[PDB]
Amino acid sequence: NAIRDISSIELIKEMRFGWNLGNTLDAECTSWMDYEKNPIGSETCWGNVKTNEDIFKTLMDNQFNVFRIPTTWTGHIGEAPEYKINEQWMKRVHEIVDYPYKNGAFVILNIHHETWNHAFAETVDEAKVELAQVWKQIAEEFKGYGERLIFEGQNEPRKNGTPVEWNGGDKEGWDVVNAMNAVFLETVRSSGGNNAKRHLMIPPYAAACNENSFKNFDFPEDDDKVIASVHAYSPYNFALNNGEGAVDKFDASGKNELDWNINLMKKRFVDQGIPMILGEYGAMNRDNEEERAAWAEYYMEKITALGVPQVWWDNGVFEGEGERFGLIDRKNLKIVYPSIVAALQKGRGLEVNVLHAIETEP
């Protein structure tokens, strides 16, 4: 029940690097799964195994101490306007949050792939109501948790389906996102318990590392416990491109693009005293572990000099046509790419010591 009363800038210093529990509690399968009969079945409906504590303990052995829990509440929410969250779902989310928390790590709980938080001015009034009701129950469920539990108001709020979805945003989307962020901050701060001193993360438009999203991002000026949430899979062709133009080498043009976006984070947040966390990043598997290792160490070295931690996005996908950001085999508790983890440790300034590494095939 104890909570330290320290600023986000001071609390961020205790962070090394992070890991995402992707394609798990954020998996959304309402188009074919009966959420009434399977109230917690969505956790594994995208191919990941049921979450256990040993997954996080395997990662903490490799010096991970930040764990982001992407959670989708669509399908687990009752009818409007009360928006009652399913009790069995809230309990399972509580159990998974306890896995890294009860072992002493930082935890980030967010609202992820929602159908109702689209950044369209047509439905903001009801979207703000649902956002407030949902975060009221979440803040209530985790009242007595300390400063190591961090709430992230939104994931990538955007105008889905528009050409404006992934280009940075327009004036309409920027105002809706700012209004939604304000509702989230007020709802948590107004609740009781430790929530008045809990650290809160808010994203710009779509959490994009873009000038248009950075320029039109309202940030509170009198709350030292609010953090900016940015996602940056940079450079795009090497890290995120899953189609045409995808490259497997980390070339000089890729370094220039990455250096440009890291400088955008410095000018927007670091120089202006805005605490910021790279909540999502990573490089897709292209049979290029040593290319991704050098990229990861360079990326980690740069933002470590800025005091910004990063959180790897791990969806548990290794092969196939999907986005292959897998890093740990959750069923066998093994690090599939040990040199990538070693690069994170070396770039962060830690002693290189990779445990539970996968064997060598040759």
Residue numbers in the entry: -1 to 360
Describing publication, verbatim:
Here, we report the structure and kinetic rate parameters for a glycoside hydrolase (GH) family 5 subfamily 4 enzyme (CelD) from Piromyces finnis, a modular, cellulosome-incorporated endoglucanase that possesses three GH5 domains followed by two C-terminal fungal dockerin domains (double dockerin). In this study, we characterized, at the structural and functional levels, the CelD enzyme from the anaerobic fungus Piromyces finnis. This fungal enzyme belongs to the glycoside hydrolase (GH) family 5 subfamily 4 of cellulases and acts strictly as an endo-β-1,4-glucanase (EC 3.2.1.4) with confirmed activity against carboxymethylcellulose (CMC), mixed linkage glucan (MLG), and xyloglucan. The CelD catalytic domain displays strong structural similarity to GH clan A, a group of 28 unique GH families exhibiting a (β/α)8–barrel fold in structure, with the highest sequence similarity to proteins from GH5 subfamily 4 (GH5_4), a family of enzymes that predominantly display endoglucanase activity (EC 3.2.1.4). Like other GH5 enzymes, CelD contains two invariant catalytic glutamate residues, the acid/base Glu154 and the nucleophile Glu278.
To facilitate bacterial protein expression and to study the contribution of fungal dockerins to enzyme catalytic activity, we characterized a single GH5 catalytic domain in isolation (ORX48147.1 residues 748–1105), as well as a GH5 with the native C-terminal double dockerin (ORX48147.1 residues 748–1192) and a GH5 with native C-terminal double dockerin and a non-native N-terminal dockerin domain. We present the crystal structure of a CelD GH5 catalytic domain in its apo wild-type form and complementary structure of an inactive E154A mutant in complex with cellotriose solved at a resolution of 2.5 Å and 1.8 Å, respectively (for convenience, in this work, we used 1–362 numbering for the catalytic domain which corresponds to 91–452 residue numbering of the “1–536” in Supplemental Table S1). The crystals of the apo form and the complex belonged to orthorhombic P212121 space group and contained two domain molecules per asymmetric unit. Almost all amino acid residues of the CelD catalytic domain, with the exception of a few side chains and three C-terminal residues, were traceable in the final electron density map. Structural features that differentiated the P. finnis catalytic domain from other GH5 enzymes were longer loops around the substrate binding site (between βI/α1, βIV/α4, α5/βVI, and βVIII/α8) and possessing only one disulfide bridge instead of four present in GH5’s from other fungi. The overall root mean square deviation (RMSD) between apo wild form and inactive E154A-ligand complex protein models was 0.26 Å for 359/362 Cα pairs, demonstrating high overall similarity and illustrating that substrate binding results in little to no conformational change. We did not observe substantial conformational changes between the apo-enzyme structure and the mutant structure with the bound ligand.
